[PDB]
Design a binder for this molecule. Structure first.
Ligand SMILES: CCCCCCCCC[C@H](O)CCCCCCCC(=O)O
Lengths: 339, 291, 229, 225, 57
């Protein structure tokens, strides 16, 4: 009887949450921003093509100088790219060819990679010996490590496939904080510009906003109907961008605690692999399993552009911190710097 | 003294209806070969995402284009009894035809050798130095076919015949041209496809001993070993049935030197060549099967 | 990181001599290597250069065709074969490490020295010696033949510092950056053909001779050397 | 090539040397055979890897052919999210147990765990990534099945079975039941094998089946098939 | 055994999620619109700026 009473209390509390969310809604985003000028047509050309990978490309990350790149591929290679001149600054052989994420440190001193061995390895780019060597391997996850992101300094947050996220301490090597509350595999992370709050999206069709200092979840957003593969912040750090396997993007919000926009098309049945914004937060670029990328117009619903230079699944996206380029990686082992 | 004409008909048997049938045959061959070969070229170019022998085949698809682009000259000549064309065309028409023929044969042999070596020395689990070399042998070997053509009136009709200052090499060149552009290529193709078949049947007999096949699965493989042997046989005998005829007529033209007879009929040579131009339309089929 | 070099000594003119440098402490196979000699007249001037892939070799347009430079990666040893030694080829030789990618330090580590005795854009310093005062800042000037600012934005001017009885040490590369282990008191500026180096608090270890260098194009040319005492 | 500074020339040379190293290492890795090894609980994967924390790669060599066996048994997560990693392996080595027609799952005492194994086989050979990868089905523990079938009829697992309960034909029936789950009989082939706990021909069988797979892939890409 | 503890933890998490203040959606929409209007001139992808400042041309 107590278990059923507690379940009924949880159900009525969820109903109260739904009523509160419905009460704080006046008019959707499609109504207030109806009279703004359209973006029109956005055309991009492939300025550079970065060749050298010999397998499917699963991750990439831009440097904070908006010129250096890192990319991870299944052939056991982590390659640092010079976007301007196509030169290869570094080529790092991973101890594990099963890599599904990579991050580049904001200070540029470090890179990270993770995958199917449940361990996040960190490499020191600027050493006195001239080579790149492993500085620390972080172990402690039981499910596959699906995303990693460096914080401001000497700290990394990793989301894995065992429904738990972890904030580590690279100086020591143990989980400073553990975030729990997901009932499915966590596939994507995103960090606020102020780097105090972060967001994890999971296969439970849910996205949770955690607190790094406290270590406890603040808000939970639902509404999707399948697994979640991509997540991103708005440039002001007060909105979402969730990409799911049911061919829909959604724009949540942290203060209103309610979904705002749905970016969908009847001609699209494939899932979404990566999602990112532009510098101003007006263009939302989303990768697809339809072998191309779509440039949606936020604050509206109509499409704005198509980036169809690839002949396989687009697995990763990225917009420079400056905002002058959009790199794109796919399973045909080519990066393309659009502009 | 009695020079043998090449492309010239007295037309004393029929009132130009033979000309009509030659023209319709040649025009249909040219149209079908052009369309088929260009379509095969574009589709094979389209799937250049991987490798697998996608380079040497384009060479063949281009050589057939050279054949079918050299066809309209003889198409026009068959209407004009004599070689009314400029006495520089004969220096160039037969040279380009022989060049295209020798490169088509050589690229067939090279494709076969590439396939055999790929299968034998397992690929997963040299070309532009070869394309240049086969295009290089043909130009130097077919060279005596562009300088020894002298247009001479035979009667008064110009015949664009072939003669040899070196009567000694009339036998030595043809013997070397036939042996190293039809004998070497043929043996290479035969041994390569025989080795492929041997490997396929040696692999299969090693599993059936190990009981890797049940019933109703041993009757799908025999439906696929027969289908392979029926594809490696259509390739090995189309080479010897389309390029054999042109080679044969060269030998009889040479042996006409000592025969001093009429072994070659007036229109025999044109028909053999018309048959060979069909081979430029057959190649975008056999070497593009199962697409 | 340590480069130990040998092969010097008294040699009669017209002979031959091999200078050998052994590297121990870094991946020598990925570093281009230079050779810089300094006569007792306190003048640094570049000699040769070999790249990382054992290609793209350069020589100064004074001794070209007489010296050869080679590297051995399995043994991690750099050889310089010297033939027809003239009377003007007596100097102390240093082996210099170098690495080139986006944002590296191409003259970070120098050798130890080898005394050998026998029996084009120009870089000009302002003065030869400057009086010092620890209370005030110290400014050193340098000028070049033409502008060192390339079209890609880099201004290939370097700054060195040779203490007495020691090897030169990199301080500033590309006239606006700072090396590893160098205190942040040093700063560099300039524009076009004229550059300057500023030191805030001169100390006991800040005395010595300061040298300019350009890496815009070969041959690399040093300055006269300002002597802070 | 002419408006590059000296440092930019050296940077481009470094990039080219890195490209050469990548090409060499990538030619080294296309000569190794990768085999994704699957199974179910207590199938017999341990004895298979013996007689011949995430993924556990294994390396071995047989007659100048290098193999890599990517066991993923210990990783409990959604297969839908990392099974496309292995899209591109030469063959799949699927191990099941013949003596599993009388045992039951610990979580639920029904479906005799063999219909559970068949569920995984159906889910793996009908995937949208493995439409062109062969399978090497190992039917493990054939010696214990001989005594188990002499006491208990096989109809316990199969209501529709109709035949005498001897080993030589019950094994054929179970082989046929596993092979009938294939929906693309032309693109991919299943190389079934009856192995014991003390059998020494399993690695040789893997070698023969994988040379066959490679030959068929070559004939397929050359156009002859 | 531990299931009731998990249910209690879930109820506590929902209770703490039920004590969060919320602003009306019009305010959030206005803030996003103002932010997008404030950075419309410094977005290279949004406005196709001339190749004078482009570093990839
Ligand atoms: C298969 C062989 C190479 C391809 C042949 C292409 C078909 C048409 C071109 C023929 O080469 C006829 C041209 C004149 C006769 C030359 C030989 C005359 C002699 O010396 O007896």
């Amino acid at each position: 009887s107590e278990l059923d009473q507690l379940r009924q209390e949880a159900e009525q509390l969820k109903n109260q949450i739904r009523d509160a969310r419905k009460a704080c809604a006046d008019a959707t985003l499609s109504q207030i921003t109806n009279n703004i000028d359209p973006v029109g047509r956005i055309q991009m050309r492939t300025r550079r093509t970065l060749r050298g990978h010999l397998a499917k490309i699963y991750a990439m990350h831009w440097g904070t100088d908006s010129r250096l790149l890192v990319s991870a591929s299944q052939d056991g290679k982590l390659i640092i790219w010079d976007s301007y001149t196509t030169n290869k600054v570094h080529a790092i052989p991973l101890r594990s060819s099963w890599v599904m994420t990579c991050a580049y440190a904001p200070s540029g001193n470090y890179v990270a990679c993770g995958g199917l061995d449940n361990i996040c390895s960190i490499y020191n780019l600027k050493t006195r010996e001239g080579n790149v060597r492993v500085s620390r391997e972080l172990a402690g996850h039981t499910g596959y490590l699906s995303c990693c992101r460096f914080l401001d300094d000497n700290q990394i947050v990793t989301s894995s496939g065992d429904t738990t996220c972890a904030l580590w301490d690279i100086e020591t090597g143990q989980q400073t904080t553990t975030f729990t509350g997901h009932t499915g595999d966590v596939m994507s992370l995103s960090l606020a510009p102020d780097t105090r709050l972060f967001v994890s999206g999971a296969c439970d069709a849910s996205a949770k906003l955690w607190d790094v200092r406290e270590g406890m979840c603040r808000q939970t957003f639902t509404g999707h109907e399948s697994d979640i593969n991509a997540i991103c912040f708005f440039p002001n750090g007060n909105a979402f961008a969730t990409g799911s396997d049911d061919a829909t993007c959604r724009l949540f919000d942290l203060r209103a605690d309610q979904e705002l926009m749905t970016y969908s098309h009847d001609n699209i049945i494939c899932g979404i692999t990566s999602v990112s914004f532009s510098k101003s937060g007006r263009l939302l670029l989303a990768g697809y399993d339809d072998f191309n990328c779509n440039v949606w117009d936020a604050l509206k619903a109509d499409r704005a552009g198509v980036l169809a230079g690839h002949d396989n699944r687009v697995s990763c996206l990225g917009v420079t911190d400056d905002g002058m380029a959009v790199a794109t990686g796919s399973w045909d082992s080519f990066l393309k710097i659009w502009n | 003294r009695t020079r043998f004409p090449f492309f010239s008909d007295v037309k004393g048997d029929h009132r130009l209806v033979l000309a009509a049938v030659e023209t319709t045959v040649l025009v249909l061959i040219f149209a079908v070969s052009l369309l088929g070969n260009v379509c095969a070229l574009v589709l094979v170019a389209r799937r250049r995402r991987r490798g697998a022998t996608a380079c040497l085949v384009l060479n063949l698809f281009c050589a057939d284009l050279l054949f079918i682009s050299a066809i309209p000259l003889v198409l026009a000549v068959r209407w004009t009894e004599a070689w009314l064309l400029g006495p520089v065309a004969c220096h160039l028409l037969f040279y380009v035809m022989t060049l295209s023929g020798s490169v088509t044969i050589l690229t067939l042999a090279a494709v076969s050798l590439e396939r055999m070596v790929c299968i034998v020395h397992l690929q997963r689990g040299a070309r532009a130095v070869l394309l240049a070399l086969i295009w290089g042998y043909s130009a130097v070997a077919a060279l005596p076919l562009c300088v020894f053509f002298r247009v001479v009136p035979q009667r008064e009709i110009s015949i664009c015949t072939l003669i040899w200052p070196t009567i000694p090499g009339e036998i030595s060149w043809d013997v070397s041209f036939v042996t190293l552009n039809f004998l070497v290529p043929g043996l290479v193709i035969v041994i390569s496809y025989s080795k492929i078949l041997q490997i396929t049947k040696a692999s299969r007999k090693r599993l059936t001993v190990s009981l890797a096949y049940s019933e109703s699965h041993q009757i799908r493989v025999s439906q696929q070993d027969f289908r392979l042997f029926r594809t490696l046989f259509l390739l090995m005998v189309s080479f010897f049935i389309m390029w054999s005829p042109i080679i044969i007529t060269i030998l009889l033209i040479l042996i006409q030197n000592f025969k001093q007879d009429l072994v070659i009929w007036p229109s025999l040579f044109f028909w053999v060549v018309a048959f060979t131009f069909a081979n430029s339309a057959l190649n975008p089929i056999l070497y593009n099967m199962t697409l | 990181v340590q480069l130990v070099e040998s092969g010097g000594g008294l040699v009669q003119p017209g002979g031959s001599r091999k200078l050998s440098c052994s590297a121990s402490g870094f991946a020598f196979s990925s570093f281009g290597m230079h050779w810089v000699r300094q006569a007792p007249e306190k003048g640094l001037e570049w000699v040769a250069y070999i790249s990382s892939g054992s290609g793209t070799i350069y020589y100064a347009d004074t001794v070209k065709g007489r010296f050869t430079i080679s590297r051995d990666d399995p043994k991690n040893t750099l050889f310089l074969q010297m033939t027809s030694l003239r009377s003007e080829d007596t100097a102390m030789y240093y082996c210099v490490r170098s690495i080139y990618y986006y944002g590296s330090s191409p003259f970070d580590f120098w050798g130890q020295g080898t005394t050998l005795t026998v029996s084009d854009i120009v870089m000009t310093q302002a003065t030869s010696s400057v009086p010092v005062t620890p209370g005030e800042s110290v400014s050193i000037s340098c000028r070049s033949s033409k502008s060192l600012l390339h079209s890609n934005g880099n201004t290939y001017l370097y700054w060195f510092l040779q203490r007495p009885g020691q090897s030169p040490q990199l301080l500033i590369y590309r006239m606006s950056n700072l090396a590893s282990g160098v205190p942040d008191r040093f700063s560099g500026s300039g524009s076009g053909t004229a550059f300057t180096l500023t030191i805030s608090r001169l100390e006991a270890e800040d005395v010595g001779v300061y040298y300019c260098m350009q890496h815009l194009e070969y041959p690399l040319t040093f300055g006269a050397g300002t002597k802070l005492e | 090539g002419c408006t590059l500074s000296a440092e930019d020339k050296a940077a481009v040379e470094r990039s080219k040397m890195i490209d050469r190293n990548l090409r060499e290492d990538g030619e080294k890795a296309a000569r190794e055979v990768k085999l994704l090894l699957l199974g179910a609980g207590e199938s017999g994967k341990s004895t298979i890897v013996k007689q011949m924390t995430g993924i556990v790669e294994t390396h071995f060599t047989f007659k100048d052919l290098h193999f890599k066996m990517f066991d993923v048994g210990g990783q409990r997560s959604e297969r839908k999210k990392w099974i496309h990693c292995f899209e591109g392996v030469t063959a799949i080595i699927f191990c099941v147990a013949l003596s599993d027609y009388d045992l039951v799952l610990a979580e639920d005492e029904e479906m005799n765990r063999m219909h559970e194994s068949m569920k995984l086989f159906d889910s793996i050979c009908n995937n949208k990534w493995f439409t062109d990868t062969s399978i090497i089905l190992f039917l493990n523990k054939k010696d214990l099945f001989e005594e188990k079938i002499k006491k208990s009829p096989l109809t316990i697992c199969y209501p529709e079975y109709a035949g005498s309960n001897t080993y030589e034909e019950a094994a054929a029936y179970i082989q046929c039941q596993f092979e009938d789950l294939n929906k693309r009989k032309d693109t991919k082939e299943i190389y079934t094998h009856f192995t014991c706990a003390t059998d020494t021909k399993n690695v040789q069988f893997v070698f023969d089946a994988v040379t066959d797979v490679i030959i068929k892939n070559n004939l397929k890409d050359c156009g002859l098939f | 055994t531990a299931s009731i503890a998990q249910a209690r933890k879930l109820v506590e998490q929902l209770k703490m999620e039920a004590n969060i203040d919320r602003i009306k959606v019009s305010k959030a929409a206005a803030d996003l619109m103002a932010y997008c209007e404030a950075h419309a001139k410094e977005d290279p992808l949004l406005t196709p700026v001339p190749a004078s400042e482009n570093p990839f041309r």
